[PDB]
């Protein structure tokens, strides 16, 4: 019913999320869980 | 000079760029440091 010009602005559907309190056991975070498990196994074996 | 329809595809100018060792725990110190550490241990 009307004439449009070429798009002066291109858009689309997008996701908006909100932009952290430390965990109780976050002192284990520097090392991976597999490292801790293998440390326990190595301790037992040693 | 010609009639274009609405864009069936949108694009722009973009940048294309080209996309741990087993004993990598030794990497902080140089190889010569480890070798001289062994020598110094023997001498001590």
From Swiss-Prot, chain A:
It is found in: Cell membrane; Postsynaptic cell membrane; Postsynaptic density membrane. The chain crosses the membrane at residues 33-46. Belongs to the glutamate-gated ion channel (TC 1.A.10.1) family. GRIA3 subfamily. Ionotropic glutamate receptor that functions as a ligand-gated cation channel, gated by L-glutamate and glutamatergic agonists such as alpha-amino-3-hydroxy-5-methyl-4-isoxazolepropionic acid (AMPA), quisqualic acid, and kainic acid. L-glutamate acts as an excitatory neurotransmitter at many synapses in the central nervous system and plays an important role in fast excitatory synaptic transmission by inducing long-term potentiation. The postsynaptic actions of Glu are mediated by a variety of receptors that are named according to their selective agonists. This receptor binds AMPA (quisqualate) > glutamate > kainate. Homotetramer or heterotetramer of pore-forming glutamate receptor subunits. Tetramers may be formed by the dimerization of dimers. Interacts with PICK1, GRIP1 and GRIP2. Found in a complex with GRIA1, GRIA2, GRIA4, CNIH2, CNIH3, CACNG2, CACNG3, CACNG4, CACNG5, CACNG7 and CACNG8. Interacts with CACNG5. Found in a complex with GRIA1, GRIA2, GRIA4, DLG4, CACNG8 and CNIH2. This is Glutamate receptor 3. The chain holds residues 512 to 560 of 888 of the full protein.
